[PDB]
Amino acid sequence: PLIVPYNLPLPGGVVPRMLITILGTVKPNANRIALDFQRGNDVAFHFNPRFNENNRRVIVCNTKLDNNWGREERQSVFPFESGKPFKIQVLVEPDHFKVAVNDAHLLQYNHRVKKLNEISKLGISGDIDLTSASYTMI
Ligand SMILES: CO[C@@H]1[C@@H](n2cc(-c3cc(F)c(F)c(F)c3)nn2)[C@@H](O)[C@@H](CO)O[C@H]1S[C@@H]1COC[C@H](n2cc(-c3cncnc3)nn2)[C@H]1O
Ligand SMILES: [Cl-]
Ligand SMILES: [Cl-]
Ligand SMILES: [Cl-]
Ligand SMILES: [Cl-]
Ligand SMILES: [Mg+2]
């Protein structure tokens, strides 16, 4: 039981081999969820499950620079279910973020923002009950 939207500080930003783990439960009749890895006002990595975009479930990922969204990267593999407990793991790798949901690889997102050590906050928003948000090095 964390309040959403939630901000998780990432002290000194991110680095390869840093693992961020988000645990929560999707609300019944969910519409949207977002994780925003921020570099100040920029969004280095936005990870955004949409439960009803034109009656399809899709994951949208993108980057926001100087208040402008870039080119979306879309994934129709959709591992979330309304009402169910989930685990999102975001592993920072040298060239990409790697995302696994419920221990199954979902997607990678190549780094657009290159100053990894300035990506110093993770925002968590949308239609979830949030249980925990933490990080470790592996
Ligand atoms: C509603 O605005 C979103 C942005 N967004 C989401 C949130 C958000 C905030 C929260 F508090 C949340 F809890 C939360 F989950 C999400 N805040 N900003 C962000 O997700 C951004 C990422 O690019 O998208 C915009 S909507 C963007 C607008 O312009 C057209 C884009 N469009 C449509 C299609 C297309 C392609 N193929 C098939 N069908 C439709 N393709 N592109 C569309 O996706
Ligand atoms: Cl959205
Ligand atoms: Cl659903
Ligand atoms: Cl940068
Ligand atoms: Cl930041
Ligand atoms: Mg590569």
UniProtKB/Swiss-Prot annotation:
Keywords: Acetylation, Cytoplasm, Differentiation, Disulfide bond, IgE-binding protein, Immunity, Innate immunity, Lectin, mRNA processing, mRNA splicing, Nucleus, Phosphoprotein, Repeat, Secreted, Spliceosome. The keyword Cytoplasm applies. A motif (Nuclear export signal) lies at residues 114-129. GO terms for cellular component: cell surface; collagen-containing extracellular matrix; cytoplasm; cytosol; extracellular exosome; extracellular region; extracellular space; ficolin-1-rich granule membrane. It comes from the Eukaryota. GO terms for biological process: eosinophil chemotaxis; epithelial cell differentiation; innate immune response; macrophage chemotaxis; monocyte chemotaxis; mononuclear cell migration; mRNA processing; negative regulation of endocytosis. The modification Phosphoserine is found at residue 76. A beta-D-galactoside binds at residues 69-75. GO terms for molecular function: carbohydrate binding; chemoattractant activity; disaccharide binding; IgE binding; laminin binding; molecular condensate scaffold activity; protein phosphatase binding; protein phosphatase inhibitor activity. It is found in: Cytoplasm; Nucleus; Secreted. Residues 6-136 form the Galectin domain. The keyword Endoplasmic reticulum does not apply. A major expression is found in the colonic epithelium. It is also abundant in the activated macrophages. Expressed in fetal membranes. Probably forms homo- or heterodimers. Interacts with DMBT1. Interacts with CD6 and ALCAM. Forms a complex with the ITGA3, ITGB1 and CSPG4. Interacts with LGALS3BP, LYPD3, ZFTRAF1 and UACA. Interacts with TRIM16; this interaction mediates autophagy of damage endomembranes. Interacts with cargo receptor TMED10; the interaction mediates the translocation from the cytoplasm into the ERGIC (endoplasmic reticulum-Golgi intermediate compartment) and thereby secretion. Galactose-specific lectin which binds IgE. May mediate with the alpha-3, beta-1 integrin the stimulation by CSPG4 of endothelial cells migration. Together with DMBT1, required for terminal differentiation of columnar epithelial cells during early embryogenesis. In the nucleus: acts as a pre-mRNA splicing factor. Involved in acute inflammatory responses including neutrophil activation and adhesion, chemoattraction of monocytes macrophages, opsonization of apoptotic neutrophils, and activation of mast cells. This is Galectin-3. It comes from Homo sapiens. The chain holds residues 113 to 250 of 250 of the full protein.
